[model samples]
Target: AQYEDGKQYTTLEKPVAGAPQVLEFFSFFCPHCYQFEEVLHISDNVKKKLPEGVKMTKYHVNFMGGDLGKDLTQAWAVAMALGVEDKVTVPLFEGVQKTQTIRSASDIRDVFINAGIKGEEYDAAWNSFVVKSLVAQQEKAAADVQLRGVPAMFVNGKYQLNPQGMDTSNMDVFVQQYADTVKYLSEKK
Candidate 1:
């Protein structure tokens, strides 16, 4: 692993209790984050190696501060609400980067509709109070951390992995380094 304990990664502003919480700060529209997903298969890579008590959470960052950001952020929350996060996340990226099909809120809805979700069902999740609250909480968490970039990592809500500062010339090496770092931190507390 290329990262040090406190140099490349630092403690969180507010520590979380219970099992380790690995929070992935990401944005669907970021090309780097998209590439990280493609190269790392991040969710699969991280989840497979997670310790017994460790839990992973994905948060969509709103850096753009516009309709595009809000729309995509809400899309993510709704996708998670309808239990389609694992199914729709990559497609969501593909839609934006490759297919160029996700331009508006309706376009985001179509991704779910094409994935066997009914329009009304997606609406229920999109407009539900639970989804709304979750999105709000996600936004608040991003602000609380003063996040400035995407595809960042926060382990146990304390150690923030500074992957950008690490040597990533080799994708395989970077992946292992990230996985090892996460595993090591997950084992702590």
Candidate 2:
């Protein structure tokens, strides 16, 4: 239900720098995304095995409802600002997905704290100019790309894997195949 010929892009601005990009478009509130994260440790192993020039980036898929939605948007901005997303994004996603507890700014801060991230710098970073600019960038990108869903993966700037379209429920297998597909396409380029 999504198109990517010349429109409906995911707004991955960083572009993996020099590496061939494996961009994942994902929303924090989507159940499929939660499920995907449940099995995402495989990605770590895959990362070890990736060919040269392949790197992964997770772009926020910022469309959803409720506090989880705002929390995700703000969390992404905050983590990026604190220079600690690589340290905390996975744990934060797992906590929100597995626990039934209500999510809030403070709840997320606790998660970061538990993960050995300091809250003093975190809170300051959350409201900093750089973080605010990142949020603005995400918002502008969401509007510019006309994004409408979650957990979409692109290989080298092309939409290639989506849970809804792929019709797979076993997240581990789905992600394996997804990553393999990216490898295939990227090598062909």
Candidate 3:
């Protein structure tokens, strides 16, 4: 139940802005996180139920693999800038974890280029002021959360969902429960 916190979620002391958004802090390197996007399509499912402007905000975490983590975050930020997030996201995640490659910024650049983003334009967004600030914001958010793992979902700025505690015996039900919790929390308070 999303009515109040006990098991399914913990209410945040310093909740994010009450914008009724789903703020997912995840990583490309995390296998479950990758699956959450590709296999399950949980975010997509939830997005359909959300009201307009209540977007599915995905942030690639910058605390996973030293500087490479930041590089990956930069890659994600670039995709957001070029409006090619879905285009480069799957391939880059595949490059990073599925095949276990993706070693540097150049490798990330290659993925964006192959996705048809011109190298010059990629470089422009790579070093652009807005992209840099987004990456910085990602890092700061990483510091903000008491993260024990990736794929954490924060809803309505007041709850950090306890997915592990949620019943996962049925995958479909789990998805529904997760989405329902998010929707319920979005309307809470």
Candidate 4:
């Protein structure tokens, strides 16, 4: 396994769990993250390539602390609670990056609607107090980690992956390097 200069990632005090955890911290409004969506494409192949016992998660960041940030993060919490994140995630990015149409809750709901999510399910998830609490919990967790940017990656909740200085213009190479580094860290644990 290839490890970069060793400065590309940071090790944490404790792992999140015994099983490996791979996390991507992102925000819908982040343009660089939108570009990453174009690269990863939520590709099944990437999911398939994970080693056994390794889990992947995406955390929506809301450092802006405004209506748009709050709403988008809450919308993500709703999608996550509804178990429809894989269905609505890419569209959320595209709606902002490609169509520039997600201006309100209704627009976010419309993205899910276009993705085949039922209106009733959307309403249930959107209005859920559980979803609201989950968003708050995520916000607290982000703060606990002192997250400062989108597209931040972590392995096993311990090692923070930094891909700076990599050739991001070459999507395949950049992603592979990231995946390899994560896999390497997991194996080390």
If both were scored by TM-score, which would come out higher, candidate 2 or candidate 3? Answer: 3
Q: Please list the Cα RMSD from the true structure of every candidate, rounded to 1 decimal place.
A: 2.9, 5.6, 2.6, 3.7
Q: Which runs in model 4 stand beyond 4 Å of their true positions?
A: 1-6, 12-20, 32-35, 41-43, 99-106, 110-123, 126-133, 165-169
Q: Which residue pairs overlap in candidate 3's backbone?
A: none
lDDT of each: 0.73, 0.61, 0.73, 0.68
- Top candidate when judged by TM-score against the true structure: 3
Query: For residue 122, what is the lDDT in candidate 1?
Result: 78
TM-score of each: 0.81, 0.64, 0.83, 0.73
Off by over 4 Å in 2: 1-20, 38-42, 66-68, 83-91, 103-106, 109-120, 165-176
lDDT string, candidate 2, 68-96, tens digits:
56666767788877767767767776665
Q: How far is candidate 1 from the true structure (C-alpha RMSD, Å)?
A: 2.9
Q: Which pairs of residues collide in model 2?
A: none
lDDT of 4 by residue, 1-189 (tens): 355445668766555553237767788876667566665653244576777777776677776446666667777788878877767877887777777677776777777777677778777866778876778767755655566556677666677777545544677776676666666666755
Selected candidate, larger TM-score, 1 vs 2: 1
Looking at model 4, residue 23 earns an lDDT score of 69
Question: Model 1, 9-119: lDDT tens per residue?
Answer: 777667655413787888877677677667668667878897677878778877754666777787777787877876777678787878765667777777778777788
**Ranking 2 against 3 by lDDT, winner:** 3
